[PDB]
Amino acid sequence: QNAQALNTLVKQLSSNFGAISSVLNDILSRLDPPEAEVQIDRLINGRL
Amino acid sequence: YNSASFSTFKCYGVSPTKLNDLCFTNVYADSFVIRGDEVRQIAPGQTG
Helix, strand or coil: CHHHHHHHHHHHHHCCCCCCCCCHHHHHCCCCHHHHHHHHHHHHHHHC | CCCCCCCCCCCCCCCHHHHHHCCCCCCCCCCCCCCCHHHHHCCCCCCC
């Protein structure tokens, strides 16, 4: 059960939660702050 | 991006000043002519 919990927590890191991508570098390298901030907001909510 | 006498220079999902820092699989180019009032219809989610 402990192993399953940890594995699920790890696997939840690849979701998009509605953002364009699940990689922070792929977002920073393509956008200005005013929209990267929105994408980061969505990602932050999901991971929290 | 630096050339003047351009009515519109607008990018969706990409920061224009960052375009020199990215690599792509391939690039398409689409060319045509329309009226001045019709230029707003060229947009994602736009209706016309």
